[PDB]
Symmetry: C3
Subunit: 217 residues, 3 copies
């Protein structure tokens, strides 16, 4: 139903101790990256937010983060979901600490939200109050600054991004042009925490507006 | 069955009367582009043709147009379909005129056509007599020149494209290498108006002949 | 069920005589290749192996080979499957021989292997004892050298590639970074035949270990 949280689910997690040099090379790891933490889940942008959160209190870097074509509902295998993320760290223990923070965040109540009665339209309107090292890098902002992380299906997202930019004192940092691999779209916008919150609220309202009257015209 | 029209459907439409400067920049709007029209539908190449037509009937430009991975039948949300298009214009009235022209074209009888009994093979063989500003730029030809707009699933398309090029005095302007995002293939071909139509007819017949005998010499 | 072969299927085959100059140019055909053989199937990496085998038994080159977004299970038309391949040869006779050799290999008992009861996790761990001209070119090795052709879903593949590289005297030749169009991943590894075999065995065991305990870390 409208405003229901879509629960995100972790599907697989593994640690690699002593990654092989060939893989370190293809993954373009830094010399001090000895261990990898691998994770897949059925919701990509939640997982991206969670990996970024893990970087704040552990010595891990997000070295790989990709979404699957056509999303988790079209996955052909059980563990592919719609995202793969890889953390790299100095040891299996520090990687485990990052993975633990990732899982905790994924289960913290964050998630996409339904915009209508049968949950056939959903969006992500997440106020990242202080970025870690991953989203700060991708958005081009300093670690510790705020983002609105806004995602919705393509038309909803273009419409609602415009609404969010008009409603709030925020800047466009990164545009997820439609389609992403999952056939969504959105952006990372930056500003103060209150401005990012105002952008999240406006984005959510606008997606719901489209959902209620898609063909108004 | 064979030759049945696959009806295209519009799923959502919206106008933005005056776009935020931030979005105007990311969408690379022209300075006089104040307003946007957004549309999604369940058939990408028909929508691209329709948007091109809108640039002829109203003072609008196609500023964004992309297809969705694995097509409308695999859409995970209600309005994603398999295409998003964005028209930009000087005011909401011109954008509204462009969107109306787009919707009119989509319901005009143009569409993909079935090639077999259960409609599991389909193709597009559309002769654009006079391109607007969108398909001309996509093909690299002058606005107003003609196009054969040919799309089919990968093997059918490669076979039928080769057949069309032999059948008519046309040149390949843009190759849609398999897979497109929707797992189709095809091309935009140009030439005189009669040659583009001759190519369309040849493309259609060639797709049909594969569809009628998918394993070729293996029976 | 676990260790079942997943049967691959050919969906469409067609021969062209005297390809158009325009299509010959776009496919970068050799001047004397006047004939094309088109094939589609529902399993991409098996078909890529089969096309490479065809180049050993007939005077054909692989000139096109691509996978479809989201795999055969999500195909929207009857003949798209998840792969298109194109063989080129001097005449329909050579192309016909190559297509027959491709079909015979696809029907030879090669295939992805199931890792669980409902065949919702599967992997490919194929030792190519003697490459043809297609996979040797893709891997950057001399024609006739051996390959381990290793494919699995994204997390399984990264984990199991690391296991394969550690288990045998092999080098990574080509990395299929997740996602491929079909939302798989893997690599081509080379070495001696026994080392490629050792890599395949290690890859298969590692994929199975993830399938048996996906969330244990
Ligand atoms: Cl044939
Ligand atoms: Na599907």
């Amino acid at each position: 139903m409208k405003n229901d949280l879509i629960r995100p689910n972790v599907l697989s997690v593994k640690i690699i101790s002593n990654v092989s040099p060939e893989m370190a090379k293809k993954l373009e790891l830094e010399p001090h990256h000895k261990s990898l933490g691998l994770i897949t889940a059925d919701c990509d942008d939640v997982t991206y937010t969670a990996l970024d959160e893990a970087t704040k209190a552990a010595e891990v870097d997000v070295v790989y983060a990709r979404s699957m074509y056509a999303g988790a509902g079209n996955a052909s295998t059980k563990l592919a979901g719609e995202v793969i993320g890889i953390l790299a760290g100095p040891s299996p223990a520090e990687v485990r600490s990052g993975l633990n923070a990732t899982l905790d965040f994924i289960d913290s109540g964050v998630g996409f939200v339904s915009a209508n009665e049968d949950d056939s339209i959903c969006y992500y309107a997440q106020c990242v109050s202080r970025t870690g090292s991953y989203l700060s890098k991708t958005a081009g902002i300093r670690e510790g600054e705020a983002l609105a992380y806004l995602v919705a299906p393509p038309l909803e997202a273009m419409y609602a991004l415009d609404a969010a930019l008009k409603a709030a004192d925020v800047e466009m940092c990164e545009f997820f042009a439609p389609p992403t691999e999952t056939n969504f779209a959105g952006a990372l916008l930056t500003g103060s925490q209150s401005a990012c919150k105002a952008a999240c609220d406006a984005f959510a309202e606008a997606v719901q507006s489209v959902a209620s009257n898609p063909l108004g015209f």
